[PDB]
């Protein structure tokens, strides 16, 4: 029988006024015989009508995927409104309902620190620039690196870790050719989170 999965907007989309956040309600296992699906959407319990159904997609396993998408206001999301998707179908003796919203709780401002490479790393072909981001809540966040106005893409970032004080932390690690460090290039850790001023902070790191 049909099953439903409801996904939140991307952190980046909710934090950048210049982007457009959306919630996505997915109905998998829709049968060939009863492909018709009804969507009702609710924002904190009030029905809204501006959703749009995405093109139907036939699946290798002889079922359809049906997707409804609802756009959302950044501040409705960040103020933690609850979005409810209700799915009805002939193969479903009862309508399925699903809800999401921002993780509940007081937002806390990340503290962002940059850490130079260890003196013991200085032997190696490349070195690690670290960015420690701690004391943040909720765990929705984006971390990116740049140098001289350009993205630096050779980085990996750890999953958020729940800390003993109820906030989260993570580390981001940017790997650069050691000569790029010795040359005094300034690298910057850019963090987006709701509890930062204008949702954004940048911390820089260069040879001392």
């Amino acid at each position: 029988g049909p099953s439903v999965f409801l996904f939140p907007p991307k952190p980046k989309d909710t934090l950048m006024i210049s982007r457009t956040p959306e919630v996505t309600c997915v109905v998998v296992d829709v049968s060939h015989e009863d492909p018709e699906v009804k969507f009702n959407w609710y924002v904190d319990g009030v029905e809204v009508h501006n959703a749009k159904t995405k093109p139907r997609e036939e699946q290798y396993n002889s079922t359809y995927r049906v997707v409804s998408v609802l756009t959302v206001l950044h501040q409705d999301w960040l103020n933690g409104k609850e979005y409810k998707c209700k799915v009805s179908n002939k193969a479903l003796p009862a309508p399925i309902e699903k809800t999401i919203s921002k993780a509940k709780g007081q937002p806390r401002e990340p503290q962002v620190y940059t850490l130079p490479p260890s003196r013991e790393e200085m032997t190696k072909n490349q070195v690690s620039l670290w960015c420690l981001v701690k004391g943040f809540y909720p765990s929705d966040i984006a971390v990116e690196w740049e140098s001289n106005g350009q993205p630096e893409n050779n980085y990996k970032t750890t999953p958020p870790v729940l800390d003993s004080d109820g906030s989260f932390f993570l580390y981001s690690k940017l790997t650069v050719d050691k000569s790029r460090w010795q040359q005094g290039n300034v690298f910057s850790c850019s963090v987006m989170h709701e509890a930062l001023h204008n949702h954004y902070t940048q911390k820089s790191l260069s040879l001392s």
Binding site: M16, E146, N198
Partner: peptide, 13 residues
């Protein structure tokens, strides 16, 4: 004031 990320507008208070 505003925050930009790689030229792109993040937010303004």
């Amino acid at each position: 004031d505003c925050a930009w990320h790689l030229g792109e507008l993040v937010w303004c208070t």
